[PDB]
Coordinates of C-alpha atoms and ligand atoms in Angstrom, one line a residue:
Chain A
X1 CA 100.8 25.4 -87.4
X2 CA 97.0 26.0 -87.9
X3 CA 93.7 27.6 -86.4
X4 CA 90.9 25.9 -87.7
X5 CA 87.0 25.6 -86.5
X6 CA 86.5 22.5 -85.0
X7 CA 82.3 23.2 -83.4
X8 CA 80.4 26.3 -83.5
X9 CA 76.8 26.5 -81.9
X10 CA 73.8 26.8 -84.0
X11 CA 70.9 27.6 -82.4
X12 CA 67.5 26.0 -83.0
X13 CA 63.9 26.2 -81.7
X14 CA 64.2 22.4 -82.8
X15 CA 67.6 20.6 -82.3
X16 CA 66.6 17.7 -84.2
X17 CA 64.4 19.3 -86.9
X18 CA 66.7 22.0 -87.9
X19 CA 69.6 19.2 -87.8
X20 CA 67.8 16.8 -90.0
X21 CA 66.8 19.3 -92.2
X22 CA 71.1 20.9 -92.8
X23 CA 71.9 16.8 -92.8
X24 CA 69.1 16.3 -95.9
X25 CA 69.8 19.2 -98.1
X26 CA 73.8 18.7 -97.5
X27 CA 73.5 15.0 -97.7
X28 CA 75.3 14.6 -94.3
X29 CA 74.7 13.2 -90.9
X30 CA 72.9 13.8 -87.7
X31 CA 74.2 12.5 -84.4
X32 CA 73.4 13.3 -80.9
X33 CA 76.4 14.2 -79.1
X34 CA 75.4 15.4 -75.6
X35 CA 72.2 18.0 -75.7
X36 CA 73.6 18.5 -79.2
X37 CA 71.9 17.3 -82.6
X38 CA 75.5 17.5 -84.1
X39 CA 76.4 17.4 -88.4
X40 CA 79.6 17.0 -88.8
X41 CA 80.2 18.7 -92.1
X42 CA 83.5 17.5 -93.2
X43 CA 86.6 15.6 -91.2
X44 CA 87.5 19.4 -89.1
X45 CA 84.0 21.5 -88.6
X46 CA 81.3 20.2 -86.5
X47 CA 77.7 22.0 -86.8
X48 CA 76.4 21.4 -82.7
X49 CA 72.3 22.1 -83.0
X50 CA 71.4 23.5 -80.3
X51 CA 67.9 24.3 -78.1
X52 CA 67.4 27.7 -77.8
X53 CA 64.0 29.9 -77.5
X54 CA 65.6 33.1 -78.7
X55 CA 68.0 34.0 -80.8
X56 CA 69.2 36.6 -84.1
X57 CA 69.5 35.0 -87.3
X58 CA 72.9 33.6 -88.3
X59 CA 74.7 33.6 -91.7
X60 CA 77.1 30.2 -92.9
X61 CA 78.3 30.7 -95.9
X62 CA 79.7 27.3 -97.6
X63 CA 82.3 27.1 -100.5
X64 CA 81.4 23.6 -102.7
X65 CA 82.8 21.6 -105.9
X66 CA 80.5 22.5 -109.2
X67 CA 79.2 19.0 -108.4
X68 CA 78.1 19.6 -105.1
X69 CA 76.3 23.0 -105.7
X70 CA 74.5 20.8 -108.4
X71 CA 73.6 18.4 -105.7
X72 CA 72.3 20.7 -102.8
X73 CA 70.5 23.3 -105.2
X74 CA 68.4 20.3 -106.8
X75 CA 67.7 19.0 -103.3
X76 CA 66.3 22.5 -102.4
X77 CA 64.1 23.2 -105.5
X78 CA 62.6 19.3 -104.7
X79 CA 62.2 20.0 -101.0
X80 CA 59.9 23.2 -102.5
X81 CA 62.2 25.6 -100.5
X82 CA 62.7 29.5 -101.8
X83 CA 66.2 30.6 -102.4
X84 CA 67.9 34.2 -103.9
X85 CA 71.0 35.4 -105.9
X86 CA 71.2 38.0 -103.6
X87 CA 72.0 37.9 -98.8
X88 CA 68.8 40.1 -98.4
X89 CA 66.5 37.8 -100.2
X90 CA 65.1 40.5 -102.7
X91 CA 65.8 38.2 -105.7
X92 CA 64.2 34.9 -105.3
X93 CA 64.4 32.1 -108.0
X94 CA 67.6 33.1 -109.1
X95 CA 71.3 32.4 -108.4
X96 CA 74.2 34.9 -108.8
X97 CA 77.2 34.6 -111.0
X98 CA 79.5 36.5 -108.6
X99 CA 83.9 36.0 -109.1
X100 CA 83.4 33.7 -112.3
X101 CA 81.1 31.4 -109.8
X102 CA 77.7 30.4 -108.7
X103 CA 76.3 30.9 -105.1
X104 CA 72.7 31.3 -103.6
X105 CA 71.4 32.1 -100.3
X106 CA 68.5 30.2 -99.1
X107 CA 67.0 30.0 -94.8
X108 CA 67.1 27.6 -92.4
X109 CA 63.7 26.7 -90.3
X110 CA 64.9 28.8 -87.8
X111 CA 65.7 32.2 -90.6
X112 CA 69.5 31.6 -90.5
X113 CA 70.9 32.6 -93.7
X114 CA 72.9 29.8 -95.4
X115 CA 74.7 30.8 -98.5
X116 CA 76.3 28.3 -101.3
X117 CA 78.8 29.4 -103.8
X118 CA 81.4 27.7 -106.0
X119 CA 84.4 29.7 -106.1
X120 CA 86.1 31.4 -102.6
Chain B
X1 CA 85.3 16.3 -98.4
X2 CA 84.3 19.5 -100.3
X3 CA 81.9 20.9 -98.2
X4 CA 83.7 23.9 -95.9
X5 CA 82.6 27.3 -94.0
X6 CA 84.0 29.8 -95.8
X7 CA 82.9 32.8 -93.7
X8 CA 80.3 33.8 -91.1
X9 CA 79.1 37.0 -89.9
X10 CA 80.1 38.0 -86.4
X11 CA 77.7 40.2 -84.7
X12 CA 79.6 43.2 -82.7
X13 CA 78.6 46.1 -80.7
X14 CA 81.7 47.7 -82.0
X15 CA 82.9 45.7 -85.5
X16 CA 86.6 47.7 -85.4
X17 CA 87.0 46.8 -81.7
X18 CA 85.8 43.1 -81.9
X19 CA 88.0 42.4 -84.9
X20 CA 90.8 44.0 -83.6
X21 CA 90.4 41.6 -80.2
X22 CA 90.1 38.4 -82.1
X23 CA 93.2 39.3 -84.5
X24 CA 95.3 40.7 -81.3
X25 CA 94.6 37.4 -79.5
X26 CA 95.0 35.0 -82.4
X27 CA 98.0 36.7 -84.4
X28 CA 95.8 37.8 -87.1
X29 CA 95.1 41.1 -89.3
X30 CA 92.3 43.1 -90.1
X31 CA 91.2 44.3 -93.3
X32 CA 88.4 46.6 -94.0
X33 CA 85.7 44.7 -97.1
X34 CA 82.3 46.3 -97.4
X35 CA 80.8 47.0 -94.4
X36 CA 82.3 44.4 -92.5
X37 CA 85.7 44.4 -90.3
X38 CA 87.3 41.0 -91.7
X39 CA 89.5 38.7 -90.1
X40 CA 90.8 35.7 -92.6
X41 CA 91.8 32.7 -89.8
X42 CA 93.3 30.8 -92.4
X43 CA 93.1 29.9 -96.1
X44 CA 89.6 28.5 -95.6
X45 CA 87.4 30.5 -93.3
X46 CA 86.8 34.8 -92.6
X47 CA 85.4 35.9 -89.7
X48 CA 83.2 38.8 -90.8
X49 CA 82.5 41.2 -87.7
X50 CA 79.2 43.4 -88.4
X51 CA 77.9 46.3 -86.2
X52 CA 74.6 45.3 -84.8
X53 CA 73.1 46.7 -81.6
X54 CA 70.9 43.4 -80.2
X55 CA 72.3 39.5 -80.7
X56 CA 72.7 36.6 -78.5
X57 CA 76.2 34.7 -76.9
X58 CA 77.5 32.7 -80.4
X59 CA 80.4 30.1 -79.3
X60 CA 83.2 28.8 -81.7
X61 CA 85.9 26.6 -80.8
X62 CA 89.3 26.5 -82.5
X63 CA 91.6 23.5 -83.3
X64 CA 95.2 24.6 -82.8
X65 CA 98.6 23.2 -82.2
X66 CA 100.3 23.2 -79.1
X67 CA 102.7 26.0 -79.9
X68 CA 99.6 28.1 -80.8
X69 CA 97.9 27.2 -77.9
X70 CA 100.3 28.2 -75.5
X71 CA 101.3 31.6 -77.6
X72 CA 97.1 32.3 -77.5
X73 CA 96.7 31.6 -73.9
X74 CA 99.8 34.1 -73.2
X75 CA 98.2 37.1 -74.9
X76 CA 95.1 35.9 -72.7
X77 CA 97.0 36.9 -69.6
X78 CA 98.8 40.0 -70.7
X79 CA 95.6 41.2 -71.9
X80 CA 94.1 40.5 -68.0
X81 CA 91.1 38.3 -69.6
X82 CA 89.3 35.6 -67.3
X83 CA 89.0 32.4 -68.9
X84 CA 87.5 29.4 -67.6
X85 CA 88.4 25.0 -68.3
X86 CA 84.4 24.5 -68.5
X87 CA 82.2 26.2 -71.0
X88 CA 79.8 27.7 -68.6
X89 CA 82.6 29.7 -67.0
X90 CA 81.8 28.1 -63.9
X91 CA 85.7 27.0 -63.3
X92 CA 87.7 30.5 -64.1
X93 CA 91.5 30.8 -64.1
X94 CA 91.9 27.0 -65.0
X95 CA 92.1 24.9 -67.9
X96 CA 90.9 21.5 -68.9
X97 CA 92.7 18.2 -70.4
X98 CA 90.1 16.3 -72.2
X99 CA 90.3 14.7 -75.0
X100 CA 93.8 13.8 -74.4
X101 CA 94.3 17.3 -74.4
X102 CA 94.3 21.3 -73.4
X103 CA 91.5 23.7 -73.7
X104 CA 89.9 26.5 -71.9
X105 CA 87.0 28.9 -73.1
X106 CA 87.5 33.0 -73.0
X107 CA 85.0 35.6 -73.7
X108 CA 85.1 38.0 -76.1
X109 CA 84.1 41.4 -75.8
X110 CA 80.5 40.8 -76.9
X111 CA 80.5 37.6 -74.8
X112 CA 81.0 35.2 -77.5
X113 CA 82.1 31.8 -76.5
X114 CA 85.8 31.3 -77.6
X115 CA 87.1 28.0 -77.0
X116 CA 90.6 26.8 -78.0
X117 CA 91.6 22.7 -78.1
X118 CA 94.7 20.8 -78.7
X119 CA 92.8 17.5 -79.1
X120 CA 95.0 14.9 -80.8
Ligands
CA1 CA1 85.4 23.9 -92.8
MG2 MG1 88.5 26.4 -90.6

């Protein structure tokens, strides 16, 4: 039938921190699944934080319901975190209006890029 | 629930090369969208190969059915990859039955982590 992503890896300098901190802006869950801090983001995908000194920055880019975006993007501004319309974080304070939807980029603790946006 | 990954950026020595591996393997297509060689796994989720010259091992594991499984794993051989049943490749040319089920783990050719499961 159907390839779908069940894990994927995300490195961390802090499993547990940079677990917690996905969890509390997404309003999800941390468990620790083996030397994973795992969030299981919905009932297929798995995010599996894991320990790692060095690493590139990653991008995740996460299609939401209107009342979801709400959700996250009010946790972020109360969590005093910067965010920008555009991937290379020139625009800050700002969201974009791109295909008729809303979307954002804001960074992990680690730099990962993690983007938000309404309509795929 | 409403939270899903809609794309993530691949980092490839060679974008047109690495794109064209995962789409062989997986029976998908590549299409050309900014500067970005794009591979669309399903309705949900693009795999966005960019050209970058220095990046660590990322690892994603795939959810498929049985029929898939075995029609992946077949272009495997032809296409003489190694492939191993544990994820540190310690166990090559086998796979495993966990989780009531198959999977094995293949490199790609930036050494990403590929794994492919059955589950239940
Ligand atoms: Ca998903
Ligand atoms: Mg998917």
């Amino acid at each position: 039938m159907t390839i779908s992503l069940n894990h994927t890896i995300v490195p961390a300098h802090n499993k547990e921190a940079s677990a917690q901190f996905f969890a509390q802006i997404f309003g999800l869950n941390v468990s620790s699944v083996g030397h994973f801090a795992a969030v299981r983001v919905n009932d297929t995908l798995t995010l599996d934080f894991d320990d790692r000194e060095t690493f590139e920055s990653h991008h995740y880019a996460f299609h939401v319901s209107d009342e979801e975006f709400d959700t996250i993007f009010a946790r972020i501004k109360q969590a005093g975190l910067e965010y920008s319309s555009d991937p290379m974080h020139h625009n800050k304070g700002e969201i974009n209006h791109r295909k008729g939807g809303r979307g954002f980029y804001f960074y992990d603790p680690n730099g990962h890029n993690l983007e938000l946006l309404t309509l795929s």
